[PDB]
Amino acid sequence: MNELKHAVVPIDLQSFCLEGTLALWVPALENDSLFKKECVAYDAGVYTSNKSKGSQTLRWSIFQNRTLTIFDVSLNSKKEPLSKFNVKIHFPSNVMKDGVAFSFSEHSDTTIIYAITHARVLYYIRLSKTWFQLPDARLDDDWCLCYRPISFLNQKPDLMAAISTSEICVSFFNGGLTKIILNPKDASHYEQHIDDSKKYLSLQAFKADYRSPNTIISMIFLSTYNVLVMLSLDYKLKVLDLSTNQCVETIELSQTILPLQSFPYLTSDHTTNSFIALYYPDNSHGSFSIYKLNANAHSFKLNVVIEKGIIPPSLPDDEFIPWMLSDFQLISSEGSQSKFLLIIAWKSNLNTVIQKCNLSLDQDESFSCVWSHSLDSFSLIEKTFFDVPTNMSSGDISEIWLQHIFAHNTSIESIQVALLSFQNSSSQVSKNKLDKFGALTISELKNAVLSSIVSTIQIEPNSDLTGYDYYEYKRLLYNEWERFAKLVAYLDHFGDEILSINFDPSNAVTYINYANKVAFIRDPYLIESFDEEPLTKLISSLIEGYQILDLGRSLHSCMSFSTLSEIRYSLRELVQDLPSYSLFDTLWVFYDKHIYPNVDPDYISTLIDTLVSLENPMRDIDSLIQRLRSFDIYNHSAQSPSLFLCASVARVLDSILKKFQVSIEGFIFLLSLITSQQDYELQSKFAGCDKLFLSLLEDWRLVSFLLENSALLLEKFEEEDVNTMEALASVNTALQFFSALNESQISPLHATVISSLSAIFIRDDTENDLVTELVEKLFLFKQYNACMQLIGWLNSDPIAVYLKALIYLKSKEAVKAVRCFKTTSLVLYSHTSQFAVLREFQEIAEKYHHQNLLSCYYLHLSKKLFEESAYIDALEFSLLADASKETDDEDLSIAITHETLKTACAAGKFDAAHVALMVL
Amino acid sequence: LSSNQYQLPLNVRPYTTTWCSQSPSCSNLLAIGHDTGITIYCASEEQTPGSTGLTLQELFTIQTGLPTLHLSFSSSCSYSENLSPVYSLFLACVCQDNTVRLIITKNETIITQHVLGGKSGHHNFVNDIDIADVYSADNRLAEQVIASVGDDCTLIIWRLTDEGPILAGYPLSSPGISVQFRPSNPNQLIVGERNGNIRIFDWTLNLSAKNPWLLTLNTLPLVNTCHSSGIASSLANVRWIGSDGSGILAMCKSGAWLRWNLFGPKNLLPNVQGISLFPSLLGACPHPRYMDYFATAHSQHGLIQLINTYEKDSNSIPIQLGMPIVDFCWHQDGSHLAIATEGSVLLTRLMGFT
C-alpha cells in the first residue's frame, strides 16, 4: 500500500497567529449539575466539530467540560481573511456528556450556531464575520436566544441536525423527529413523534438498556433543495422531505446481528454532493462497506437508487485492539465521474489510524480501489540525548532541554499544567488553577519555567573547601527535566486524541480534527519516502544508487549526539569562514574530523569494497539527485491568511530537519569514501566531485539557515502601525518566508510550499542567496534583535555587508557597523532589485543628475549617521564624500560641502586644523 | 560637587579608558585608547582645594597608528628612576584589523609587540579582552595570559610563556560580549555571551594524557517581570565583585541588574535583583572598595547613575554631563571617577566616599 502523513498544529501557535481571545457568557439560571484529577479533566474535547459553506469562510470548534471554544483556520483570499482572534464561550453546564449540541449553518455573511447543554436547553448564537475579523471587544446586539421548543425533559435528545437558518431538527431516543422554527421573539414547532416498543415475549428477557424500535441512529442532510436521509433502529432506510415533514421513502435492509453492535457518537452516513453513502461494519468481521445511493428526484416524487455492495477493510488493527470508526466523509471529483474518494478515521484509545479509499470506475461492475495507509506511533528521542552537555556549542544544561520542548513543537497546555503543578509544593488546585489561567503571555512563560526549576533543585556543595558538586547537579538536572517531560508526554498520551473529519468545498482540502490539536493530511514527499529507509519496501515497490542512499542513512544514524553537535558547530563555522581556504583540500580534512567518532576500520573497508565496485558513481548521483527539483507555478499571491503561515512553519521544520539529515548523510559519505588511496582519487578514473560538493554545501547552508530561522518567534507592536503586510503583523517566526512565497488542479498549501522549496533549490539561476534576500526584507519590519546572530551567521556579500552595517546600527554598537560601512562600497546602486533600501541611495544618486562613483555613497552614509543621532562618525564620513568626488559637479560638490557643514555644526568650534586630522 | 576637565588633543577621538587598578605600583596611571594609539596620564594630589584633591597630569602618548577599542593593563607594569624616570608598560588591546595585540613599552617607545589575528585569531569582530599574570610555585613570571571573546562565537585563551606561545580556542553558544578573570584566583574566569549566558570557567583543566568548563548562569529568564524588561534585553556586561572574587554582577542593555554571591548552604535563585533608570550600553563598573556599589551610564545623554545592591541607593545620580559619555572607570581610591567623552576626560570627586 501507499502511505500518508500528518501535519500537527500546536494550539499555542494558533494563539500566536491569533492576537486576542474574547470570552462570552449567556444567561444561566436552571442548569443541572486532587491535582492530577483536575489536570486530566482540565482539557480534552468531548467532541470536535468543523464547518464551512459555499460562500467564503471557515472555522473550527473545540468542546470542553463546562466550556465551549472556537477559532479561525481558513485559507481564503479576501481583504482581511488573515487578521484573526480566538473565541471562548462559557456555559452554565457542559455541552452534554454526549456528541450532540453541535450545529453550524450560515445565511448571509454571518455564522449561526445551534447548541445543547447537559440537561434540557437549546442555544442559538449569531456571530458576524466582521466580529471574527475585528480585534475589538465590543458587540452591540442580541447575539443569542436560548429556547426550549419541545419538552426535552420528556424525550431527551440524542441527535441534532440543522436544515436552515431559522429551522432545525431534533431526534430523540423514542424515535420521534421534531422540527424547530426560531425567529427573533418567536418559535413555532413541528414533529414526527413516534413511540415504539408478545407481551408475554416482552415479560421475560425484557431487561436491557433503554431502546425504541423507531429511534434513528444517525441523520444526514443534503440539499438539492430540502432533503434528509435517515437510518432507524428498525434498521430501515427512511428518507425525509422538509416541506412535508414526512417519510418520503423507505428501504428494508435485513441484518439481525447488525443492530447488536451499538456505538457512541459516530457518523453512520455522509455525502459528496447530490449522492450520499453510508456503511455498516457487520461487527467483528470489520468488513464495513460503501452503499453510495443515487437519489434521482422526480417531479412526482423523489426517487432512491442504491448502486453498490461492499468495500473491504485494511487489516493492521488486531491484538484485540478495538478498531472504532470515528467519522468518515465521502468526496468525489466534480470534474468527471472517473473516481470517488472516501476519507475514513479509525481510533483505538489514544491511538489512531487514518485512511482514504479511491474508487476508479466507469462501466466496470468490478472494484478498482487504491488504498492509502497511515501510522501513528511514539518514538522517544528522550532518554539518550540527555547525558552529555560538555561542549558549549549548546552549553550549560537547562537551555538545551527547553530547546528540546521547543523542538518538539506539537504539545501545548500540557506544559502549562505541568509547570504550575510542580511549583505547587503540595499546594491545591482550585486557586492554583486560576493561576494557570492568568499567565497567558508566552515570552515570559519560559522565564517563569526556569525560575521555578532552579527554585526546586538544591545544589549540594562538594565539601572540599567552599566548593560545589556540579557532578550531582548533573544527574539532578537530567532526571529532573526528564521526569518533567515524561509527565509532559503523559499529558499528551492522555491528550493526543482524534474525533472527527470534515471536508471543505471552498478549499478542497483533506481536513482533520484531533482533540485540541488540529492537523492535516498530505501525500508522501520524496524525502519522506527515502527517509523511511524502505529498502526492502522499495524493492517490494538504469536502476542503481539507492541502496547506497539507504545504507548511508543507516551510517548517519550510526553516529552519536555530541558528534552531531561538533558537526553542527563546525558547519556553522563553515558558513562564513570556509571560502577563505583553498577549496578542495578541506575535503580529506573533514574525514580527518570523522575518525574521532567510532568508525571501525572494518566498517570503513566494508564500505570501500562497495565503492571500488561502483560502475560510475558521480554520473548517476549528480543527475538522479538533480531530478529532485520540484515544479513551482506562478509564484503570485493573493492576500494570505494565518493557518497558511504557521502550519507551513511546522511542516517545514519537519521537512527541513529531515533534509539536514539526508544532506549531512551525503557529505559524510562523500568524504568517508574519498579519504584513503588519495593518489588513486586524483587519478581521475572516477569523474571527481568537488564542484557538486560545493553546490551541495550551498544547499546545506540554506537548509540549516532555515532550521535555525524557525526558532526565533520575535515580534512586537510598540508603534503598532498596520493584506500580507498584516501577515507580517502576526507574531510567529519563519512565517514571513512563507508569506514571501505563497493552483490549476492542486490544493493551495502544497503548491504554496512548492514555490518556496523551488526558490530554495534554485542556485545560480536566482543569482542571489535566499538568506540575503530574507534578512534584506525582514529587517524592515521587525525581528531587529534576532537578525544580529542571524547577520553574524549570514554569508559575506555586499548586500549582507550593508545589512551587517544597518543591524550593527540598530543595536547602536557603532564601531563594528562603521567598520562594515568602511570596508565596502556600492556598485549595486540603481539596480532596484534590492528591496526598500536601494531606493534611498538611488534617489541620492539621481539628485546629482548622474551616477558618481563614490562620494555620493559616503554622503548617504553621513545622512544615515545623522539618523543614528551619533554625529561624530558623520564628521568622519562627510569628509570622505567631500574628498573622493571624481565627478566635479557644481550642485553635488555644493550639497556635500553643505552636509559637511551640518556635521561640523554637530562638533566644530574655533580651532582650524583640528578637524583635518581625525578619522577612524 | 567638583569636577576637573582635561582635554585630549582635539584630533584624538577616544574609544576606551581604564585605570591600572590591576597593579598598585602604577595605580595612578590612566590610559586612553584612540584612533592612533594609547595615551598615558598620571593622577596626583595637588594641594588643590580639598574638594577634588586630585589632578591629572598628561604624561605621554604612545602612537600605534590605528584605533584602540579596548584596553587592559597587566600587573607587570612598573616604574623606575635614573637620577630621567622610566615607565615599563604592558598593554593588551584590540585594533582595526580585528587583531588582538600585546604591546610592551618603555614609556612612549614601543619595545615589543605580539599580534594574534587573521584565521588563527578571531574570525570576526572582537568585543572584549582581559589580562592576568600567572606565576609558578617558585614565583618567577611563568605565563602572561590574555583572554578574548568574539562575534565569531568563540572564547580564545592566549598564553605567553617562557618557552613561547600557547593558543587555545573554545566555542560559545553565542557571540562573546564580555570577559574577566576572577580576582585572587587566576585559575578561573567568567565569560559573557550575547544571548544572556554567563560562563564560569577553569582553563587549567587539561594538560597531558575530562571535565566541562564549570558553571553556567543566565539572566534572561531571571528577569523579575514585575516590570517587563522589554523584548530585547541583550546582556551588556558581567563582572566579578570582591577581592576574593566572592560575587557576580550582571547587567543588561535594558538596565536590569542581578547579583549572585560566592562563598555556605545550598542556593536556588539569584541573591538580589534590580533595575537601572536608563539603558546601560557600556554595562556596569563595580566600585573597587564598596561591594554594594556600582555605576551605570546613559551614554547617549551623558548621565551616570550610582546603584547600591541592597537598595541603600534610592537613585543617586552624582554625575550629569551635557554631552555623550564614551567610557568610564573608578580610580582605586574609590571616591574619584574617570570619564572619557568624545573630546575630553573628566576627573570628578564624590565627597560621600572619602
Side-chain angles (χ1 to χ4, degrees), chain A residues 389-396 399 444 446-448 450-451 454-461 466 468 470 569 572-573 576-577 580-581 714-716 718 785 788-789 792 804 808 811-813 815-816 819-820 822 868-873 876 911 913-920, chain B residues 10-13 15 35 67 69-70 94-98 119 123-127 151-155 170-175 177 193-195 197 199 210-216 218 220-223 225 228 230-232 253 263-269 281 300 323-324 342:
Chain A
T390 52
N391 294 47
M392 306 209 291
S393 47
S394 53
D396 1 316
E399 277 199 328
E444 303 157 351
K446 312 166 183 185
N447 309 334
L450 271 178
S451 68
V454 190
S455 65
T456 52
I457 307 179
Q458 304 281 3
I459 298 184
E460 176 186 356
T466 68
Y468 287 88
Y470 57 96
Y569 169 70
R572 183 184 186 182
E573 207 167 11
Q576 268 202 157
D577 307 278
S580 296
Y581 318 138
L714 290 176
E715 103 144 8
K716 195 180 176 182
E718 292 182 357
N785 40 11
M788 251 286 309
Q789 58 193 263
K804 261 193 183 201
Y808 272 96
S811 66
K812 301 180 181 182
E813 281 194 7
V815 185
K816 292 129 191 181
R819 288 190 175 163
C820 282
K822 292 168 177 170
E868 321 157 20
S869 74
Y871 48 90
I872 187 173
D873 288 314
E876 291 195 354
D911 283 287
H914 280 303
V915 203
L917 326 166
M918 52 180 307
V919 185
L920 248 79
Chain B
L10 289 188
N11 308 331
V12 168
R13 176 187 172 186
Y15 289 91
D35 53 323
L69 306 193
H70 307 266
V94 177
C95 288
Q96 184 77 15
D97 51 16
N98 260 332
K119 304 168 187 173
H123 299 147
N124 212 329
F125 302 115
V126 182
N127 299 267
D151 281 342
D152 52 348
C153 293
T154 311
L155 157 72
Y170 306 100
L172 301 165
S173 65
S174 115
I177 45 80
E193 309 182 9
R194 188 194 141 78
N195 57 18
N197 280 343
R199 310 287 189 169
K210 309 176 184 177
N211 271 129
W213 300 143
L214 269 204
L215 187 81
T216 301
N218 190 5
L220 189 62
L222 294 181
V223 51
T225 332
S228 296
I231 40 171
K253 236 93 174 189
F263 294 99
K266 311 169 176 182
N267 304 328
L268 293 191
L269 262 207
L281 265 44
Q300 171 56 38
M323 64 187 70
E342 293 165 344

Side-chain angles (χ1 to χ4, degrees), chain A residues 460-691:
Chain A
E460 176 186 356
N462 206 128
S463 303
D464 44 332
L465 179 57
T466 68
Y468 287 88
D469 203 342
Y470 57 96
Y471 177 77
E472 294 176 353
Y473 193 81
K474 178 178 180 177
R475 296 191 190 95
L476 275 169
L477 273 278
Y478 302 174
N479 296 333
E480 170 83 295
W481 300 73
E482 174 181 351
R483 172 191 59 179
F484 174 89
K486 274 184 179 180
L487 296 185
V488 172
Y490 175 76
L491 226 285
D492 259 286
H493 185 64
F494 225 153
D496 205 271
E497 155 82 300
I498 94 118
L499 303 86
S500 60
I501 59 185
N502 305 96
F503 232 86
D504 299 321
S506 65
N507 303 342
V509 290
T510 53
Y511 242 91
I512 243 279
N513 290 329
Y514 290 26
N516 324 333
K517 284 100 202 66
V518 250
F520 200 74
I521 287 184
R522 203 69 275 177
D523 70 273
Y525 301 101
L526 192 58
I527 312 181
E528 311 292 333
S529 66
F530 289 158
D531 211 342
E532 298 284 275
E533 199 229 353
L535 191 57
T536 310
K537 282 187 176 181
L538 197 67
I539 291 301
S540 180
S541 297
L542 299 177
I543 314 176
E544 270 185 8
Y546 301 86
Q547 310 144 3
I548 316 171
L549 305 174
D550 278 330
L551 155 138
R553 172 193 166 278
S554 177
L555 305 178
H556 183 13
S557 68
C558 284
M559 263 151 291
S560 65
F561 332 104
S562 60
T563 302
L564 268 161
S565 306
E566 306 290 349
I567 292 186
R568 284 193 186 188
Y569 169 70
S570 297
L571 304 163
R572 183 184 186 182
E573 207 167 11
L574 287 192
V575 178
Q576 268 202 157
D577 307 278
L578 187 54
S580 296
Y581 318 138
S582 72
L583 311 177
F584 324 105
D585 282 280
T586 59
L587 311 185
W588 185 88
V589 180
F590 300 157
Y591 175 86
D592 191 272
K593 288 190 173 186
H594 296 358
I595 297 186
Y596 305 104
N598 181 25
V599 197
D600 195 316
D602 297 333
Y603 279 99
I604 302 179
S605 60
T606 304
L607 186 53
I608 302 297
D609 302 332
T610 296
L611 312 176
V612 188
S613 63
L614 258 35
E615 186 184 349
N616 55 292
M618 321 334 292
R619 306 182 184 183
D620 298 331
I621 292 179
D622 56 36
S623 295
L624 288 177
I625 297 187
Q626 268 162 0
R627 306 170 201 266
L628 103 321
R629 307 208 157 180
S630 177
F631 308 99
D632 57 322
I633 327 184
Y634 297 110
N635 197 27
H636 292 94
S637 61
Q639 336 206 355
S640 82
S642 276
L643 184 59
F644 248 176
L645 17 108
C646 184
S648 69
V649 156
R651 255 292 177 98
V652 98
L653 191 146
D654 288 329
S655 292
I656 265 56
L657 201 276
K658 296 178 183 179
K659 215 121 178 176
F660 166 91
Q661 278 194 349
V662 177
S663 176
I664 284 249
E665 292 178 15
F667 281 78
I668 284 184
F669 317 147
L670 251 192
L671 299 173
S672 74
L673 320 191
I674 318 200
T675 145
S676 49
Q677 309 171 6
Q678 298 79 9
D679 304 339
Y680 187 78
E681 305 166 354
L682 302 183
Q683 282 264 307
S684 68
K685 177 175 294 185
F686 298 94
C689 33
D690 306 352
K691 290 183 180 181

Side-chain angles (χ1 to χ4, degrees), chain A residues 83-120:
Chain A
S83 299
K84 301 306 181 183
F85 90 110
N86 176 256
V87 185
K88 207 172 177 60
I89 297 180
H90 285 103
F91 268 178
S93 62
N94 51 315
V95 279
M96 208 90 163
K97 293 167 168 160
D98 289 347
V100 290
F102 73 105
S103 167
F104 291 84
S105 181
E106 73 174 356
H107 178 23
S108 62
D109 302 283
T110 53
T111 67
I112 277 165
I113 184 199
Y114 304 108
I116 292 186
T117 60
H118 180 270
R120 60 186 71 177

Side-chain angles (χ1 to χ4, degrees), chain A residues 395-429:
Chain A
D396 1 316
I397 298 185
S398 44
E399 277 199 328
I400 318 162
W401 304 78
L402 285 125
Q403 295 184 358
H404 178 247
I405 306 182
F406 309 148
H408 265 339
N409 219 331
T410 25
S411 58
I412 300 304
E413 295 162 347
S414 54
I415 305 172
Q416 297 181 329
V417 170
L419 301 171
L420 289 153
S421 71
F422 256 114
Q423 197 266 344
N424 75 336
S425 180
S426 75
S427 301
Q428 294 180 334
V429 245

